[PDB]
Write a protein that binds this ligand. Structure first.
Ligand SMILES: CC(=O)N1c2cnc(Nc3ccc(N4CCN(C)CC4)cc3)nc2N(C)C[C@H]1c1c(Cl)cccc1Cl
Ligand SMILES: [Cl-]
Ligand SMILES: [Cl-]
Ligand SMILES: [Cl-]
Ligand SMILES: [Cl-]
Ligand SMILES: [Cl-]
Ligand SMILES: [Cl-]
Ligand SMILES: [Cl-]
Ligand SMILES: [Cl-]
Ligand code: NA
Length: 274
């Protein structure tokens, strides 16, 4: 809890809690001076000078570098007070893709093919930017993709944004902190980091597979290995042959054969979503 003269309490009116972690939570808040809603994550402050601090500050640094892109979550501010570290990001009104999937699942639905191409194109724009900046996300998965649904009053919209930049690292990085095992490419687990950007492409394909209604992905075991041999998880729908082949080459066992994020966004299959 924060003090009543904290920056957090004075400058923001806290609304709804919107997420929870081990040592923190996320609130939907209004900033009093501008009237706009933000997501503010407040976590226990990492020990100053520690490796945990290093990892926390890397996230903020990634945000500061990447957050200008239209398909990466905007960052506004970060600070520390009351033994908490705070990050104020844009609030995304549709929650994460994991939340949108779970809502879909509850009503016996899924993203249909046109929605999946839209997802894939938009997050791939996101990755193209990240990779152009010599960075890799390393943790692409539905819970780290955020959704904003907007209405434009005076046109003469659903946006997917990459968030949770806590695993972002540079392309040539010799150590890599692995992301979610359900989405982790085999080469990264083996500690081959020659083609890091293609680990994000792999994770994105599996993320679109989850959007498309696949069952829970394995964290380990024979099914996990089967996926890493290049076999797509089963989905409860029949997608076009061309779109299925895009997804499948995105999980190719050789990273070099997976599309770049650039090739991805230029792909003829996704021209229908442009
Ligand atoms: C983009 C973004 O950076 N952040 C974000 C934005 N917007 C939102 N919006 C939302 C709406 C609604 C919901 N749901 C959850 C499911 N229930 C059922 C309804 C509401 C959940 C989240 N939640 C967010 N949280 C959960 C994470 C947060 C964050 C911050 Cl502030 C700092 C560092 C890393 C991250 Cl990932
Ligand atoms: Cl402020
Ligand atoms: Cl919550
Ligand atoms: Cl402090
Ligand atoms: Cl682009
Ligand atoms: Cl997830
Ligand atoms: Cl390998
Ligand atoms: Cl899953
Ligand atoms: Cl179908
Ligand atoms: Na942005």
């Amino acid at each position: 809890a924060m003090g009543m003269k904290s920056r957090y309490t004075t400058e923001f009116h806290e609304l709804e809690k919107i997420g929870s972690g081990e040592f923190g939570s996320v609130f939907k808040c209004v900033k009093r001076l501008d009237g706009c809603i933000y997501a503010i994550k407040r976590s226990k402050k990492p020990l100053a000078g520690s490796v945990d601090e290093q990892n926390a500050l890397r996230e903020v640094y990634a945000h500061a570098v990447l957050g200008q892109h239209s398909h990466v979550v905007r960052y506004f501010s970060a600070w520390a007070e009351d033994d908490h570290m705070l990050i104020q990001n844009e609030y995304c009104n549709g929650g994460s893709l994991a939340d949108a999937i779970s809502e879909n699942y509850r009503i016996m639905s899924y993203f249909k093919e046109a929605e999946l191409k839209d997802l894939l194109l938009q997050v791939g724009r996101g990755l193209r930017y990240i990779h152009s900046m010599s960075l890799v996300h390393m943790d692409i998965k539905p819970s780290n993709i955020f959704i904003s649904r907007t209405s434009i009053p005076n046109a003469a919209k659903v946006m997917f944004k990459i968030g949770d930049l806590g695993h972002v690292t540079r392309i040539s990085s010799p150590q890599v902190e692995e992301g979610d095992s359900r989405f982790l490419a085999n080469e990264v687990l083996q500690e081959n980091y020659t083609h890091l950007p293609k680990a994000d492409i792999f994770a994105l394909a599996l993320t679109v597979v989850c959007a498309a209604g696949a069952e829970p992905l394995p964290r380990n075991g024979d099914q996990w290995h089967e996926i890493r041999q290049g076999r797509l998880p089963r989905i409860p729908q029949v997608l076009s042959q061309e779109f299925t082949e895009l997804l499948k080459v995105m999980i190719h066992p050789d990273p070099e054969r997976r599309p770049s994020a650039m090739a991805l966004v230029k792909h003829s299959v996704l021209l229908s979503a442009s």
